[PDB]
């Protein structure tokens, strides 16, 4: 009923949020509104959050559970390829994470912040917040239907999809990206390869593209992204359908025909989504409490991480006293990095992107910095792609085929 700062979810956000928070002495209590293990979407993670399952002391949790480790990412336009692997890029880092199953993954994380002090307490939901000053009272819901009130100094509002905060206040502002459609399961993957140490996307039509994220429990998730018109030209049950969008795409048809799916296959569509402001008096939002961009470059639990990171040692510096610059110190942070993620979704899906990707004799320095985008380091400002991302792109892939009418 009193505590420090208040964490609402234990996602990623919250789980990394939480744990520095209490590393710092302070209390901190999440409240969680779904019983773990709980599934949740965004399964291939960026070498960028080492950085914070580093700092939170999550890596050995995390590196117990044996999940399948990732080296890089691989597109593929028909028998096209272009592979980057995180151990030849521009900046220093990390060169190698891991493909989850969430539901495991955010149980490991929060398990471990419990462990390390957080009081991590499930199946409560929160239902209403009131602030006064920077003080807050919340409210959560037991399974039951009873409620009881929280006091704290500061609400992280690590509550994702939930978007606990934005949807009470009305800080939802749309995305800008219009609306796409998905469809994924997982599927007992008897016929992998045996080239697994990658994330794979698959260009399956102009508008329309796919994820193929091998896991180390012998599955491997896959999902259709795109122009929702698209998956209205296939009729009947989600299975059928999506077996049916499998089997049209030469990349995976035969790997994944006839093989088992663990559940039936989930829609989700209009997924961007963002926030008229980051933070208010007594509280900051974190990853998808703030802004969603798209899926493509599987960066959302790397950016939830990263400001639930952020968010953390700020709301920290707030509970000392300290003087706290959140324009600075947190928003224009999170925008340098969703900023630049932005400018290469844009790239995904306007052409220019690709023609890098699939350029003959693609060069390996432009390779590399690539890469360094696609390991979630986009706070390197001496990474050009970083530096000159909303220009880059359109203008590197001119530059392409002002190559090619030479020849
Ligand atoms: C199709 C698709 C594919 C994606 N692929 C990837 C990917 O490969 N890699 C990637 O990094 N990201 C991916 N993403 C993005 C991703 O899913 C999110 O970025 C990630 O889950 C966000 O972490 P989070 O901690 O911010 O929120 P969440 O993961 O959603 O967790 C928020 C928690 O808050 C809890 N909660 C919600 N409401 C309340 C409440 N009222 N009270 C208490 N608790 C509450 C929830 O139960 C939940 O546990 C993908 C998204 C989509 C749509």
Redesign the pocket.
Known sequence: EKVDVLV???????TVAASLVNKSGFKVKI????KFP?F???????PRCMEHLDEAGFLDAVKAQGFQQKFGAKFVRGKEIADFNFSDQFSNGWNWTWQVP?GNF?KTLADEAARQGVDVEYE????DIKFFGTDSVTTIEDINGNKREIEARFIID?????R?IPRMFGLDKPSGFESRR?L?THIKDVKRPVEGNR?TAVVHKPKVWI?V?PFSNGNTSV?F?GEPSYFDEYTGTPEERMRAMIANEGHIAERFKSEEFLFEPRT?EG?AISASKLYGDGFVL????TE?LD?IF???????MES?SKGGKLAVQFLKGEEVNWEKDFVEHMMQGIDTFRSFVTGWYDGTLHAVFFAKNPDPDHKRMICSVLAGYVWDKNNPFVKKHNTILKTLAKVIQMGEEAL
């Open positions: 609402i979810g234990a996602g990623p956000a919250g409240v969680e509104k779904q709980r949740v979407i965004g399964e291939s993670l960026l969430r955010d409560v939901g929160v239902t690590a509550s994702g999809y939930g606990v998905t994924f994330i994820w994220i999902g992204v989700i997924y974190t990853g998808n409490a969603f899926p599987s960066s959302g639990a790397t950016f939830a639930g």
